Amino acid sequence: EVKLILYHWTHSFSSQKVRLVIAEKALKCEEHDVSLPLSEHNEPWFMRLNVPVLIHGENIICEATQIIDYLEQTFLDERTPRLMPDKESMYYPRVQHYRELLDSLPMDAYTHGCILHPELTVDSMIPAYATTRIRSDNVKYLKKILDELEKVLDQVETELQRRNEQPWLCGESFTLVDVSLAVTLHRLKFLGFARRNWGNGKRPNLETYYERVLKRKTFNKVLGHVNNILIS
Amino acid sequence: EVKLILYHWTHSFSSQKVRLVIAEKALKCEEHDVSLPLSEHNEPWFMRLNEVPVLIHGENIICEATQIIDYLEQTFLDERTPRLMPDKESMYYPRVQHYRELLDSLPMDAYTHGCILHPELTVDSMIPAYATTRIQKRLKSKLLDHDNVKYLKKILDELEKVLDQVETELQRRNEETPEEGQQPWLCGESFTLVDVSLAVTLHRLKFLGFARRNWGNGKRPNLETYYERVLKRKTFNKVLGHVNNILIS
């Protein structure tokens, strides 16, 4: 047989997307978490959120987006679910529009702007002493990108509204745009930007979506513990 | 110790640079050649030229040759481990980094595609002729061939201009060196990354058949001497000794 091999950091955002796509497709994959609990400077994984790789026979693929595209285009046995509609399908141009819009969110900026200036976060799951340690980019820049997020989240909420006409974001099937949405939100919850953008009083369809995928078997099996700082 | 793991294609240009740097620094590395003798269409390595390797070192994943080579030079710093780049503050650094960029910017991919297509522009190519034969419309494809040939010529004239500079630099090194004694490499006495880029480039042009155009029979004699000298270098032979022999899988 031909082995499928993945070298990744368990807590890297992009790696989470890749590993969830692997479970959503029911692929056997030999996964190697190369990260270490404590660094040489004695730091745990939630301190070091500063690219994964897939080896499949003769192919080497790098960066999550490229690994996911490789997976979608390569495993086409009928039993293997598709997470993307046919390239000439009516549905592709919409799905790919949200997928690009979600895959474009500055997660790097969010995580760095959560440790710094934690005032903008609410119920952040990162210990408070990271803020002190990391203070040895600016609030102006950070507020902006947070407001941009609202605008993006506004689009998701409005598009999510269409519920009975249960479905997922773009249709009946769980698609690649759902791994981007699911993993994005779970990270925002870790950073403390969840209460700011949904919950009681705000975006009820989005609050229902987030809670629904926490109950999903594949998501739970793959990302159930990634926000638990007690686990290496 | 912490393992060095390398996934690569033996015959890819970028894998060749990385593997040679590993051997020049005398690093232990678990190397995995992912390539297959025969493809799904039952084709050998010399049929299938079109490759980005990855290095796993502890917690680091590094992809692409230049980035892997920059990673090696910067992290492996034991006193017994050779450096292939002079200290950033050396007289020599700007000269080395300047040729390093000049060589690492050559479109090797376009040279190999333009060899499989349009072999009439190659001489004594080592790729079989039968690789080419396999690889309102009438006037559309005619215009593509014309544009691709114009491009291929252009980049081959650029190669010559790169090789003219190398030849002149090797002339400076020959004038500085007594003919009895240890001959320098491109930028000085030490073998540097720019020498691994140059060696692997020249070996590859030889394979594609773009050597006789650029050296031999009086043209670029220092470069010719350089090429023949690096074929005898121990690490080069150990690592690349057989990468141009289509009889070996």
Author numbering:
A (entry chain B): 23 to 72, 77 to 162, 200 to 228, 236 to 302
B (entry chain A): 23 to 72, 76 to 160, 189 to 302
Source paper text:
The ganglioside-induced differentiation-associated protein 1 (GDAP1) is an integral MOM protein, proposed to have an auxiliary role in mitochondrial fission and fusion, possibly via redox-dependent interactions with cytoskeletal components. GDAP1 has two GST-like domains, followed by a transmembrane helix, which anchors the protein into the MOM. Structural data have shown a covalently bound dimer interface in GDAP1, and while dimerisation is a common feature in catalytic GSTs, the GDAP1 dimer is formed differently, with a unique interface having a central disulphide bridge between Cys88 from each subunit.
The A247V mutation site resides near the N terminus of helix α7, tightly surrounded by helix α3 and the α6-α7 loop, and having van der Waals contacts to Val121, Tyr124, Cys240, and Thr245. Comparing to the wild-type protein, changes in the crystal structure are small, but an overall movement of surrounding protein segments is caused by the presence of Val in this position, due to the increased volume of the side chain. Ala247 on helix α7 is a central residue of the GDAP1 hydrophobic core. As the most dramatic example, the mutation A247V inside the folded core decreased the stability by 13°C, indicating the importance of a correctly packed hydrophobic core for GDAP1 stability. Ala247 is one of the most conserved residues in the GST superfamily, indicating a role in the GST fold. In GDAP1, Ala247 is so snugly packed that even the addition of two methyl groups in the A247V variant causes protein instability and disease, despite only minor effects in the crystal state. A247V is an example of a mutation introduced into the hydrophobic core that may have long-range effects on the entire protein structure stability. One of the residues in GDAP1 highlighted by the KL divergence analysis, Tyr124, closely interacts with Ala247, indicating a GDAP1-specific arrangement at this site. For Ala247, a mutation into Val is predicted to be slightly stabilising, indicating that such a replacement, in a tightly confined pocket and with potential long-range effects, is difficult for the prediction algorithm.
